[PDB]
Amino acid sequence: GTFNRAMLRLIPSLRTYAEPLTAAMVEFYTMSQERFTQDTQPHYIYSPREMTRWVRGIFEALRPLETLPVEGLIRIWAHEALRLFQDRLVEDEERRWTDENIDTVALKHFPNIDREKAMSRPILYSNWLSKDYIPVDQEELRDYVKARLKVFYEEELDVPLVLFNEVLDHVLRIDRIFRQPQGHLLLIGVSGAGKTTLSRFVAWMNGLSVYQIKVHRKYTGEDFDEDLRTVLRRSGCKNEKIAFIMDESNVLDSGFLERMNTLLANGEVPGLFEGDEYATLMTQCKEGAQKEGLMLDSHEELYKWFTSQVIRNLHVVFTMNPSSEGLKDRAATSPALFNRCVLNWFGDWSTEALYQVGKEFTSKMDLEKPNYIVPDYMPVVYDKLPQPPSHREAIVNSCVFVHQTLHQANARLAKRGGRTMAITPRHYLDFINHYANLFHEKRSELEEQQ
Amino acid sequence: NQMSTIAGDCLLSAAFIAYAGYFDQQMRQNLFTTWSHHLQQANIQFRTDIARTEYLSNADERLRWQASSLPADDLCTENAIMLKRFNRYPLIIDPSGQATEFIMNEYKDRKITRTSFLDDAFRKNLESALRFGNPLLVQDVESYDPVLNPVLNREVRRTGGRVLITLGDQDIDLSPSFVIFLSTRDPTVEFPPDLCSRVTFVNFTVTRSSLQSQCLNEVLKAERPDVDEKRSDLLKLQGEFQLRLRQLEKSLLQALNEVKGRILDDDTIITTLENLKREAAEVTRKVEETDIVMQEVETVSQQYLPLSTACSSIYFTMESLKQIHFLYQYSLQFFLDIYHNVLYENPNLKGVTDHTQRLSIITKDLFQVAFNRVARGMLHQDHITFAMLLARIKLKGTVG
Amino acid sequence: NVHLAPGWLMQLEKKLHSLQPHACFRLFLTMEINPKVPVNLLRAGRIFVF
Amino acid sequence: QDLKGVWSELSKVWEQIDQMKEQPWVSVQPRKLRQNLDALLNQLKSFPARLRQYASYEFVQRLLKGYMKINMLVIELKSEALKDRHWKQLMKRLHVNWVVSELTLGQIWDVDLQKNEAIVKDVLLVAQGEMALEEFLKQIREVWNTYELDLVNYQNKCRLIRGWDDLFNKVKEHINSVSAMKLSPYYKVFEEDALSWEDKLNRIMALFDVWIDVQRRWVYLEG
């Protein structure tokens, strides 16, 4: 309450709303804490740290805005609540529960407000279409990200992307994380969901250059130390923003995780730079500080400035598969993954996403069939399927059904105790590409025969 | 009409080629049936009798694999089809080991080299295969080197004229002829999800249904050549016989274009024309006489179905015998030799022509030869045990 | 006494697998029943218990 | 009147295309080419509908679309991996008269890249293989021209050779590399270089194989 009273002083219009806002804040925090515990998932921990982050985020959103109605205040409060509490949730019913409970508490502690404007389904906030952190409609955001994606295939690396709603929100989450000092990000997702791809895209958006190590056998700890020294030198001395990205493959080695944990926590690692390495570090650090506009001579303050530069310039992005048991060992070996890095969870590709990828990628196809007749009853697996669907919609819905069929078969085999291979969206992309090649070859053969 | 159905069968074949790689025969068939039920439920035009082993590959490739020591089985043919049209380099799971030799024989003309992840020189070998273009088959995927992640992901940078893969620290080039083949000898193993995503699995492990079908096919070939011949004919009714018709049409086109007014001068083109007419008539006759042939071959297959079930049961008995003693390690090839010895080179069948009597003799002699070969490699105390298992299997098989 | 050198046993199994013997070649391994025998060697051989 | 008008409007686009076709291949920038062709496509799309109905406009639009789709063949052709030998092979395959200083975008845009894609990707994959092999040769050349023996003082008597393991490992890996390159389908072009280099490497291996034994025995006998 006293924090929120300090915060609201920027906007004199809302001063009497401090108590309802802080009361709803505390209430929702308590419900989230009691509902989600460590028993269900290893990362379901809730603390005053999250709610201080909440206050900080609302303050950051409110700082440049000159004045905003109460519905805007509730919108910002709900957006921060979603980004802090819904983001870490793993399974869909939990996300629905936290979403609905946010609406419930906001309406309970804030009567006499318009529900529709204060809170809607696509509560999105960004600073790409405007100077400040004003909410943006998802369609204009979609056009902007599609243009930047065009530029992104043009420059850096060409990765074809389709843009559905989930990736749209995930880009926003990553961008929000990147524009924060010591903004380490952690991603839980099945392989092929694009975690590295969207991370690279957003890093290019914010100007962060991408660095990834190449882990192999005989990649000893000394190689990791050397790569860490290189990235530390680039981030701190040269004031070059680095988007460090490590998968699970390089995390497997235990020796790396101690150094990573120390770097995540304190922004620096002791013993990485020693002897002549320390001398070279100080030599380049003095030049970098002079370039910045500071005059430091003694080694301790130079190292402190280097640490501050690394804090403000390094953004480690971790990616791992959704293995909750494995998440337990990751928590055991390194608390920084769960104390400092903000965790995001998008392992599941929704049916809507499956539909969108299928429709986009099977566009050069020719499934158009004027004489195709709509069946009276169809196995609709994509609820938002337009009806009466064309042939194309039927084929892509069929493909989505194939993906859910493999998911169900793997679940059934796991129930029986048999060995089960993960079914990833990479499998779906492979299926679509094979469909393209096979359909093209067979149509060509039929046409040549004709 | 074939154009009206191309979307459906292309969908089924692609979904089968991407998925259904790790699963066994039963799960593959169940998934295909569920898929087909969905599209027919969705009013999607698909042919009701897709022969996946025939739609994705034609006769010459099958003959080439058979000359490449590929065992002639439905699952083996489907796997080999997967080994041909692969977007991601496949992972072979073959406890028996015929798939590996099949790969080397297939790509021997391409100078295929064998390598194992356990070998320390493997990385160097990989570089060579990447830098020159010769295909490489890497074995023992249990110790999978994460340095293979780039090659598997196909991220290549074209800087200057340089098409490079950052294989670890190095930045070596890629040759267009390169292709990797991951292999496994242990059927029971768990892979990280990233590996599973970046590879398509091809399972060569033999299950109860798979071996039962293989033994049934071998019986149909050995004892009933007419039934096996007709079943093969319906296997070639779609695609193959039509291809023969098309090449006959091409020959007719060439022959008629060749004549300079000799269409009437010799009056001999009519012989070729009536030959093509007879071939088309026999193709059409086999095309109309299908359902009868399925019901007949299905009756014949059901006739020997208890035999195939007994074969699968006894073979899995031999496999599970490893628990009794460590000396009881028996291969699928050993059981195959037992099966050849009971089927061919059997003195008891000589002079017997009754199909039912020959079948009964074959069931008796199968158990007899199996016990004769196994007990010689067993301690004396365990002979009673194996006799007990064989008796129980016969009880399960026998009717009444 | 082939059981005395298991590594020798696995390397002989590798040599035997990639080879085309003459139509009358026969390799016999007299061995003491011992777990040290390789599993693959047992799998590729006609076992005889004495 | 309408035909004269549509000819006048297409005159600017035709003159632009002629300007593009006059650019010598050495000076063409395929990315600038793609941007400018996209600009031309937009300008043509800005034409009035009454002119869009004529066959000339559709023909020019199809030519522009074909130019766009063969622009990726242009991308791959501009690559430095293409050598003179590959250019003469392409010369034979397309039965043309391109002169090395005379190559221009016009000559290749006149030749139907929409008809002979099979030939060109064949020759370009061949070029990729040959270039990979010759760059392997360049790496071998530089590593064996830069390599120096590590000499370290021994009891103020001599400067003995160190790093026997590293040198032997390097020569072994290089020997295996040339042996494997012998099996490459592109090995024929760089055959003589491979012969010379493998002779050098085998002589190297024999020399230091004798040298390590001589050094060890000398050191022991000195002791």
Ligand SMILES: Nc1ncnc2c1ncn2[C@@H]1O[C@H](COP(=O)(O)OP(=O)(O)O)[C@@H](O)[C@H]1O
């Ligand atoms: N939204 C998307 N649209 C299209 N393709 C995608 C999308 N997300 C991922 N991909 C595909 O995934 C591949 C990269 O996956 P990657 O990001 O490495 O998986 P992970 O997230 O496990 O690191 C790319 O080739 C890309 O085609």
